[PDB]
Curated annotation (Swiss-Prot), chains A, B:
Superkingdom of the source species: Eukaryota
Annotated gene: HSP104
Taxonomic lineage of the native organism: Eukaryota, Fungi, Dikarya, Ascomycota, Saccharomycotina
The protein's name: Heat shock protein 104
Induction: By heat stress dependent on the heat shock transcription factor HSF1 and the general stress transcription factors MSN2 and MSN4. Expressed at a higher level in respiring cells than in fermenting cells. Expressed in stationary phase cells and spores (at protein level).
Region (Repeat 2) location: 5-67
Family: Belongs to the ClpA/ClpB family.
């Protein structure tokens, strides 16, 4: 079970670096790994299950707290 | 003269706007414009002088400024 990093998912290892700093921060966070997941992790379908879309995450990433995390410390978002 | 961005390049100024979040910045600096230049500013060909997209700039922006360079001044560096 889950014996693989699954770069298909695990590109976010790099790919999540998108919004980590752009909150004026250090490293990647929950929304912020998720931020790259709207690219990566999503159910993009007839009813597309992919969530707050272009800014709205980053928006709401800022719009909720924002600068939401720094490094490793405190529950991620 | 100086009429048109060369849309192949034209995106790059707006593509320059892309990295302020992973460069962890509110504003888009001279490292960031070049950051987008990593595509059309290049020779990407049989003999490729590309511009290194992610790897080298970041950690050498970890060398050169960081989040440290939030932005909102003019351009000094």
């Amino acid at each position: 079970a889950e014996i693989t990093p699954s770069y298909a998912l695990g590109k976010v290892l790099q790919d999540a670096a998108k919004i980590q700093k752009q909150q004026k921060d250090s490293f990647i966070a929950q929304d912020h790994i998720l931020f790259a997941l709207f690219n990566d992790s999503s159910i993009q379908q007839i009813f597309k299950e992919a969530q707050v879309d272009i800014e709205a995450i980053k928006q709401q990433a800022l719009e909720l707290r924002g600068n939401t995390r720094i490094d490793s410390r405190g529950a991620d978002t």
